[PDB]
Amino acid sequence: DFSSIASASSSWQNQSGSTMIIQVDSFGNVSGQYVNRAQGTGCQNSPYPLTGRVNGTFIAFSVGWNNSTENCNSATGWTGYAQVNGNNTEIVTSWNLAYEGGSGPAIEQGQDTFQYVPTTE
C-alpha cells in the first residue's frame, strides 16, 4: 500500500532519470516535488510541485510546468500502480503531456516506471 509510504518523505526515479520526492498522508493526498531530467524536454533540473491522490496501490499525480525558474507552458499527469519487482517496489505509470506545439495544442502519450530509492548518506 501507499499507506506504507504515509507520514514520511519517499523518493522515486524513472528510466529517463527524473526524480520525485513525495509525501503521502493518511487522507490519501500526494504532495511533492518533481525534477524532470528526460531528454528532448524543457523544464529540466528544477523542482516542480506535484499533487495527486492515492487509493490503496493506485496513484495519480499532476504537475504544471511552471515554477518561476522555467515555464514550458504545459502540464503532465501520470496514473499507475505500485508493484514489487525483485524486491524493489516500483510505480508503473502511463502519462500524458499537454503542451503548446507549433501546429497547435498537442497532447503527447508515454510511460514511466519509477523505482523506489532509499535515503542515502
Q: Hey, which residues between 44 and 63 contact ligand BTN (CB under 6 A)?
A: none
Query: What residue type is assigned to position 9 of the chain?
Result: S
Select from 65, 51, 96 the least CA-distant residue to 78: 96
Does 66 count as an annotated binding residue? no
DSSP one-letter code for 43: S
Does 10 count as an annotated binding residue? no
Q: Hey, which residues between 77 and 106 contact ligand BTN (CB under 6 A)?
A: 95, 97, 99
Work out whether 60 is an interface residue with a copy of itself (CB under 8 A).
Answer: yes
Q: Which residue, 109 or 120, has its beta carbon nearer to a copy of itself?
A: 109
